[PDB]
Design an enzyme around this catalytic site. Structure first.
Site, mmCIF file in Angstrom:
data_model
loop_
_atom_site.group_PDB
_atom_site.id
_atom_site.type_symbol
_atom_site.label_atom_id
_atom_site.label_comp_id
_atom_site.label_asym_id
_atom_site.label_seq_id
_atom_site.Cartn_x
_atom_site.Cartn_y
_atom_site.Cartn_z
ATOM 1 N N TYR A 26 -53.720 -3.013 21.800
ATOM 2 C CA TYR A 26 -52.609 -3.031 22.735
ATOM 3 C C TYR A 26 -53.013 -3.533 24.090
ATOM 4 C CZ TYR A 26 -54.321 1.223 25.054
ATOM 5 O OH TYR A 26 -55.072 2.116 25.797
ATOM 6 N N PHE A 36 -53.124 -3.506 33.549
ATOM 7 C CA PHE A 36 -54.119 -2.517 33.801
ATOM 8 C C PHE A 36 -55.020 -2.255 32.637
ATOM 9 C CE2 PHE A 36 -50.348 -0.133 32.727
ATOM 10 C CZ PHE A 36 -50.834 0.650 31.691
ATOM 11 N N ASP A 37 -54.623 -2.649 31.460
ATOM 12 C CA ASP A 37 -55.484 -2.415 30.333
ATOM 13 C C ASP A 37 -55.247 -3.413 29.209
ATOM 14 O OD1 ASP A 37 -57.213 -1.327 28.530
ATOM 15 O OD2 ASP A 37 -56.018 0.511 28.148
ATOM 16 N N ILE A 56 -50.348 10.591 26.006
ATOM 17 C CA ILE A 56 -49.156 10.927 26.761
ATOM 18 C C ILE A 56 -48.003 11.063 25.785
ATOM 19 C CG2 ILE A 56 -49.910 9.772 28.915
ATOM 20 C CD1 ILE A 56 -48.174 7.412 28.171
ATOM 21 N N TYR A 82 -47.757 9.704 32.747
ATOM 22 C CA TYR A 82 -48.448 10.437 33.808
ATOM 23 C C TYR A 82 -47.485 11.016 34.831
ATOM 24 C CZ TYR A 82 -52.795 8.621 32.038
ATOM 25 O OH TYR A 82 -53.885 8.332 31.262
ATOM 26 N N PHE A 99 -46.255 -1.386 27.252
ATOM 27 C CA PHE A 99 -47.321 -1.583 26.303
ATOM 28 C C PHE A 99 -47.011 -2.571 25.196
ATOM 29 C CE2 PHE A 99 -48.661 3.052 27.179
ATOM 30 C CZ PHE A 99 -49.285 2.632 28.337
#
Lengths: 107, 852, 415, 109
Positions: A26, A36-37, A56, A82, A99
């Site tokens: 992902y 961010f990822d 989460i 979050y 995502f």
């Protein structure tokens, strides 16, 4: 809250079960798409048992709305993410995530 | 092909935005017509046609610009040697050309006819690397107004406002984007003096024309086809004696008060997107325009609400232009196409290492920074800042950095050669920082400790090869680092280890090979960046203790050979390389201590059987040491014959050469160098000092010992300052090990307690004191001599204890008659003085018990 | 005037030794410097200058200001002067350990902020306790000031200094920096590797209804760690310049406000780089089975893209109808695709002339990389451009007449 | 250029004439002959001494001509050139020594 949107169909079948060793690629970027990822950034796949509750709430719910081999965007709500905490210096408080989920395999 | 195309030398200082040639900062000629330009046109012989290979030449020193035509002279002579000149070419509208520079394999009629004859230098003789050329985009982008912009002339003062108007009666079309956009109530206002298109603009704008209005909306269907009619309407804002007012209030929906009064929202409302409060303005000569419910100044930044209008330095007013250099993008695309089916193919992956500035969104490649030197430097400082925030250990923060940097991006930092060097140094240092730093901390001190297990595998180590540090026999311990790879739901950042060591080793082969074959690109734009970040990465990763032995051998072959050391080097590079040699010395020393302890364990039973064939027994071991003046003693002698001692000498043979020829300016270099020099000579004595830190241990216990070791690596990492709890955890765990009973001698061989005491040092400038003193007290309890080793610090511990830490002094004093004697009366003076301080008590019982 | 002169004289009096000097002499002159620093330090000249910084900041231009015009300079020097006292002795910073909140208070003055930043830099670089004192507060103002004031190299150097004392690292400030910079991903220069966008168009332009099809032949969704985009759509001449460096937002297509586009999966059209979420007859990737089809209309806006001729909703509106319009296919990496200008697998009612039929002047069909500065011939990398670009517009003839002898001559000529 | 050859030696005889032009006051009289009314072109022949393919390798040297440059220092001071010492290269060293002394004449310009 969370509002998952399918990208591509997989098997179109097996929804995740409690305790399955889900294995995915992902990438993660903000509401405004700020990256961010990515598991691909490591190239090594991310791995997580689901029903293990480690993730989460919107991920544990969002993967459940997907099936084996399936690809889908996941626009997880902050409350399921979050949220008011935010991700300590990463994701600002009350921030929805995006995502590009790519489930390799349920296990 | 034939056509006009200015070609020749020019200068970096030239403005790309201006048409080339006429400007001072150029020296070039036409193809069509064949004349030339400097400050204006001059006649110049033979226009070229298609297939006329050119060639253009310069002498510096003597100052000439002899253009060639198929090697023929036909100019811009006697030029000043200024900036250092760019080779340059510039196409007209639709004319086509093919610049080619250097590579003698590619050298042709352009070169052989004139080049290596008269004596001249095509560019790839300079370099292994392909050149990165630059070119204008047609696309305008705002840049902040230079003082005297053609002569448009910004000024500022702050009721919020700013004055305007070119003092020149200059012709046309300012496109004044304001520097700072928006994100999703607020007064804005614009005043104009002597027609104008006031409004708001999207970041992607790139239209520079007298034309207006000219730039779109969207309406979704529902494939029935019904009407999901809502979709889009924002792609911006515009309009059309005495001054006038025109605001732009928004968050959310747009407003437009002509003359300060409403004239409907001709465009309005948006999802959540950026909008520069730009204005387009044809000049009306002198004094044209002025600028400025919470203020925009508040919404734009942190101080929202903070209502009153705080005018800001970023509130620059750039004109969008046209033509700016933006890097050739050397590697690019590998497309291929067809027809009668019209298939087209690309396939091969490859990537820009991109960035953007969000406030002015742009696909600005990092390589572009190399000319964008200011923003470059700023980014390098961002890298130093991440290096600081990673903050030595402090891994928790580092994952947030992992969110902001990507592993692969660092791997690309390993990849690129064209990347300008300071940034490169920043990224490799990030690789050192985000990851490796915890490793070097974990294995530096532990590199010092030199402990060994009594495993049978340790019984099999030996010294001589049937020397070199190539062996992976290692033994010892040095507990493995625990990585914590960074999931983003819901304490030690990680890498793909084996790849990175492979990428890095390859990086060294590909590093040393270039200068071994000799070139002057020089990779980072400097040799220092051509090695130091890299040799840092390598020496550091080597400290991390990965590298399978064959790869370390690859390093050795890369150095000895038996070469990086062959190379002449810059000071800093020499420093890192000295750190590397230092690691080899530490490794070889580990080999030496390892072999010797291994021989101890090998010799144990051989001695103990002799003990019993028919403390004070340790004195009997001293009788074993009386062998200096029993064939097993002859075996011991032979082992000295082994122990007495290319590597150490090459370090001598070349480091001395460094210190000779180089003049080793800048300390620390010197210090580490001669540290090497001293540590190579008499490695026996370096071993002598090294031994007490070494301590053999029973294999069955080693696992627990290993755990105990990590506790040090907890506390010694925690030596540097919530965290107090981590410490109590650590020291508590140090209590928990049975080994601390079983092997007190290793514990005191470790600084351990003093390290704990060191924490006490920092603590004493508060609840942590409890765990500390408890530890030190029990530490006194465990054995006699250890009570002495702790006895040494009593002046400190006593003087500090004004208040429990003093109880440690007590425990240090309790048992031994020897220790009882050992204290000087002054320490007692301190005690009785604190008792004198008991004139105003119940600490007094404590101090008196110490006297007890 | 006396004040300005005394200020410059003090700043000069304390001039830090140059690094070019031999190490020893520099160390001695440096001791002299530390010494003189202390020597104004016990005297309270420090706090005197603090009082000056106070009272000069009382207003911002009052007094007959034209006589006081020097003020923008005056107070400036003092900050620098203050800096001059700070760089050596740690005791100075120790006296600022209490006054630092005031220093941040004067930090927002703007009028001499860079030098004030030198003050604070010079303070923070030395004594660690001062670094310990600073809170979950003033630093936020620091970064806010960084937001206020361009991209000073210096400011991050401060934060770099806040992160670490002398060897020990004050972590609270560090996490504080983290929370106060990194989440925004704004004022800092965020960055990431991005695969090159690449786009190609078939032959030459259009500008009634017009239509074409594009089979996907070969697409890997996640070759390279970045996802492989494959946008498709119409674009106007001079308003789309897909230079290799990318388009605005980390590269892309739809990046032109002067562009129209669709593709990939989940439908969702791109304009302005921005995607908008169109529905599909079962949303699906541009996998090879799928075939984009595009019928741009003159005057009429919306481009009804279709999945093998299956409708993909109404779309575009209100065009910048200016100049020739042309088909485009953006893609990257492991892409191979078939154009079908006309071998159509679908035949819309739309009233379109097929794009295969667009080749009416002398336009031999051949896909081209759009505008483009470069051509990778085997001879080498070409440098090319700018190149060049409808419903013909003849000049008037009828407003003229033939005189008698010449009209007769043109009649005899007429026969 | 492809020959790198005797044609260059034919040019070398012209280079000996260039030494003659370098050699008196009567050379100025050629301008007096011009009053009633050059060597640099021949310099290409000096490049031939550096040689065909070895000339391509010459940029890698930074080829043989660099050794000839040592003779150029001697040129200011020609059997003496032989003292510095492929005897043909010594002849090439001499013509370069002559051209260098001819280059000393270029200092007048």
């Amino acid at each position: 809250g969370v509002q998952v949107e399918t990208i591509s169909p997989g098997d179109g079948r097996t929804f995740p079960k409690r305790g399955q060793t889900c294995v995915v690629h992902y990438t993660g970027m903000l509401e405004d798409g700020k990256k961010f990822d990515s598991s691909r950034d490591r190239n090594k796949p991310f791995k997580f048992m689901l029903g293990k509750q480690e993730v989460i709430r919107g991920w544990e719910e969002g993967v459940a709305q997907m099936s084996v081999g399936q690809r889908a965007k996941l626009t997880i709500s902050p409350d399921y993410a979050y949220g008011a905490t935010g991700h300590p210096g990463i994701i600002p408080p009350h921030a929805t995530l995006v995502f590009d989920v790519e489930l390799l395999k349920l296990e | 092909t034939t056509g006009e195309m200015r070609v020749g030398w020019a200068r970096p200082e030239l403005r790309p935005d201006v048409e080339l040639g006429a400007d001072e900062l150029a020296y070039v000629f036409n193809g069509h017509r064949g004349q030339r330009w400097h400050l204006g046109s001059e006649p110049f012989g033979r226009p070229w046609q298609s297939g006329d290979v050119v060639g253009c030449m310069i002498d510096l020193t003597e100052n000439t610009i002899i253009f060639t035509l198929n090697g023929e002279v036909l100019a811009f002579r006697e030029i000043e040697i200024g900036d250092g000149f760019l080779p340059v070419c510039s196409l007209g509208p639709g004319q086509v050309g093919h610049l080619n520079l250097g590579q003698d394999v590619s050298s042709l009629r352009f070169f052989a006819i004139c080049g290596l004859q008269e004596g001249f230098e095509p560019f790839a003789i300079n370099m292994q690397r392909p050149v990165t050329t630059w070119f204008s985009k047609s696309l305008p982008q705002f840049e902040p107004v230079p003082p005297e912009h053609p002569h448009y002339e910004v000024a500022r003062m702050d009721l919020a406002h700013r004055t305007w108007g070119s003092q020149n009666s200059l012709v046309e079309m300012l496109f004044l984007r304001l520097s700072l956009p928006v994100q999703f109530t607020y007064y804005y206002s614009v005043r104009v003096f002597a027609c104008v298109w006031v409004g708001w603009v999207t970041p992607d704008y790139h239209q520079h024309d007298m034309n207006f209005d000219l730039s779109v909306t969207v309406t979704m269907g529902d494939e029935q086809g019904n009407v999901h009619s809502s979709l889009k309407c924002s792609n911006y804002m515009v309009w059309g004696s005495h001054t006038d007012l025109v605001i732009g209030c928004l968050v959310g929906l747009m407003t437009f008060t002509a003359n300060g009064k409403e004239s409907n929202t001709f465009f309005q409302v948006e999802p959540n997107t950026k909008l520069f409060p730009a204005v387009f303005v044809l000049p009306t000569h002198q004094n044209v325009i002025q600028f400025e419910a919470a203020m925009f100044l508040s919404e734009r930044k942190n101080p929202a609400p903070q209502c009153p209008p705080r005018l800001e330095v970023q509130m620059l007013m750039p004109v969008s232009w046209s033509r700016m250099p933006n890097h050739f993008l050397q590697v690019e695309t590998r497309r291929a196409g067809e027809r009668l089916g019209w298939a087209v193919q690309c396939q091969d992956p490859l990537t820009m290492m991109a960035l953007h500035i969000p406030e002015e969104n742009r696909c600005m490649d990092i390589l572009e920074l190399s000319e964008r030197l200011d923003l470059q430097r700023f980014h390098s400082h961002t890298l130093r800042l991440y290096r600081a925030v990673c903050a030595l250990g402090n891994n928790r923060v580092a994952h947030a950095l992992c969110s902001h940097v990507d592993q692969a991006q660092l791997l690309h930092a390993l990849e690129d050669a064209h990347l300008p060097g300071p940034l490169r140094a920043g990224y490799y240092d990030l690789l050192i920082s985000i990851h490796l730093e915890s490793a070097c901390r974990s294995r530096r001190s532990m590199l010092s400790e030199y402990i060994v297990p009594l495993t049978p595998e340790t019984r099999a180590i030996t010294l001589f090869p049937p020397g070199l540090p190539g062996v992976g026999v290692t033994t010892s311990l040095r507990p493995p680092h625990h990585f914590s790879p960074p999931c983003f739901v819901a304490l030690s950042p990680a890498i793909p280890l084996e790849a990175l060591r492979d990428k890095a080793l390859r990086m060294l082969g590909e590093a040393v090979r270039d200068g071994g074959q000799h070139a002057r690109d020089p990779v980072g734009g400097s040799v220092e960046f051509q090695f130091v970040p890299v040799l840092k990465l390598v020496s550091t990763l080597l400290v991390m203790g990965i590298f399978g032995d064959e790869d370390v051998k690859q390093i050795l072959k890369m150095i000895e050979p038996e070469g990086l050391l062959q190379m002449k080097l810059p000071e800093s590079v020499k420093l890192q390389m000295c750190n590397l040699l230092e690691y080899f010395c530490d490794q070889e020393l580990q080999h030496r201590v390892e072999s010797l302890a291994a021989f101890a364990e090998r010799y144990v039973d051989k001695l103990q059987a002799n003990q019993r064939s028919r403390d004070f027994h340790q004195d009997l071991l001293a009788h074993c040491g009386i062998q200096l003046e029993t064939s097993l003693s002859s075996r011991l002698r032979s082992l000295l014959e082994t122990v007495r001692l290319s590597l150490q000498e090459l370090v001598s043979h070349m480091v001395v050469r460094w210190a000779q020829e180089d003049y080793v300016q800048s300390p620390e270099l010197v210090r580490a160098m001669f540290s090497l020099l001293h540590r190579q000579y008499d490695g026996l004595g370096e071993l002598l000092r090294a031994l007490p830190r070494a301590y053999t241990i029973s294999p069955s216990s080693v696992e627990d010992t290993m755990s105990l070791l990590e506790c040090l690596g907890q506390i010694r990492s925690l030596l540097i300052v919530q965290e107090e709890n981590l410490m109590i955890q650590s020291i508590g765990n140090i209590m928990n090990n049975k080994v601390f009973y079983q092997h007190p001698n290793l514990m005191r061989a470790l600084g351990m307690h003093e390290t704990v005491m060191e924490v006490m040092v920092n603590v004493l400038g508060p609840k942590m004191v409890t765990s500390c003193c408890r530890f030190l007290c029990y530490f006194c309890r465990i054995s006699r001599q250890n009570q002495r080793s702790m006895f040494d610090h009593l002046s400190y511990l006593l003087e500090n204890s004004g208040i429990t830490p003093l109880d440690v002094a007590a425990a240090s004093v309790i048992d031994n008659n020897e220790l009882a004697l050992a204290l000087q009366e002054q320490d007692l003076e301190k005690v009785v003085s604190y008792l004198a301080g008991c004139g105003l008590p119940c600490g007094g019982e404590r101090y008196l018990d110490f006297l007890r | 005037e006396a004040v300005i002169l005394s200020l410059q004289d003090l700043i000069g009096y304390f001039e830090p030794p140059s690094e070019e000097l031999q190490h020893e002499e520099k160390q001695s002159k440096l001791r002299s410097l530390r010494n003189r620093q202390s020597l104004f330090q016990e005297e309270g000249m420090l706090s005197l200058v603090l009082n000056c910084i106070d009272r000069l900041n009382v207003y911002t231009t009052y007094a007959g200001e034209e006589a006081a015009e020097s003020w923008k300079e005056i107070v400036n020097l003092l900050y620098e002067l203050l800096a001059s006292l700070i760089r050596g002795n740690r005791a100075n910073c120790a006296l600022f350990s209490t006054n630092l909140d005031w220093v941040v208070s004067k930090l927002d003055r703007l009028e001499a902020s860079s030098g004030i930043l030198e003050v604070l830099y010079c303070v923070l670089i030395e004594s660690p306790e001062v670094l310990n004192i600073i809170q979950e507060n003033h630093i936020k103002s620091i970064i806010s000031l960084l937001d206020k004031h361009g991209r000073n190299h210096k400011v991050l150097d401060v934060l770099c200094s806040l992160c670490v004392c002398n060897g020990v690292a004050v972590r609270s400030n560090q996490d504080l920096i983290t929370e106060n910079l990194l989440p925004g991903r704004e004022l800092l220069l965020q960055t990431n590797l991005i695969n090159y966008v690449t786009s190609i168009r078939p032959n030459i332009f259009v500008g009634g209804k017009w239509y074409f099809e594009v089979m996907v032949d070969e697409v890997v969704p996640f070759l390279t760690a970045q996802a492989t985009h494959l946008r498709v759509g119409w674009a106007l001449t001079e308003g789309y310049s897909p230079y290799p460096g990318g388009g605005e937002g980390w590269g892309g297509n739809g990046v032109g406000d002067d562009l129209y586009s669709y593709g990939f999966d989940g439908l969702h059209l791109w304009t302005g780089h921005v995607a908008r979420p169109v529905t599909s007859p079962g949303q699906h990737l541009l996998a090879p089975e799928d075939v984009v089809s595009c019928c741009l209309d003159l005057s009429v806006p919306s481009i009804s893209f279709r999945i093998n001729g299956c409708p993909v909703q109404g779309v575009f509106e209100a065009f910048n109808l200016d100049g020739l319009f042309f088909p485009v296919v953006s893609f990257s990496a492991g892409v191979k695709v078939r154009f079908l200008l006309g071998e159509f697998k679908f035949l819309p009612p739309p009233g379109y002339a097929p794009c295969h039929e667009a080749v009416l002047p002398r336009e031999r069909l051949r896909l081209e990389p759009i505008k483009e500065y470069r051509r990778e011939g085997p001879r080498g990398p070409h440098l090319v451009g700018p190149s060049r670009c409808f419903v013909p517009c003849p000049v008037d003839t009828v407003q003229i007449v033939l005189p008698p002898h010449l009209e007769r001559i043109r009649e005899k000529l007429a026969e | 250029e492809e020959l790198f050859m005797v044609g260059e030696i034919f040019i070398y005889w012209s280079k000996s004439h260039n030494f003659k032009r370098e050699e008196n006051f009567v050379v100025q009289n050629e301008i007096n002959n011009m009053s009633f009314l050059m060597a640099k072109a021949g310099d290409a022949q000096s490049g031939g001494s550096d040689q065909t393919k070895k000339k391509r390798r010459g940029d890698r040297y930074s080829t043989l001509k660099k050794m000839l440059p040592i003779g150029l220092n001697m040129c200011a001071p020609k059997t003496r050139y032989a003292l510095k010492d492929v005897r043909e290269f010594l002849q090439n060293n001499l013509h370069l020594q002559g051209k260098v002394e001819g280059s000393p004449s270029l200092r007048w310009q």
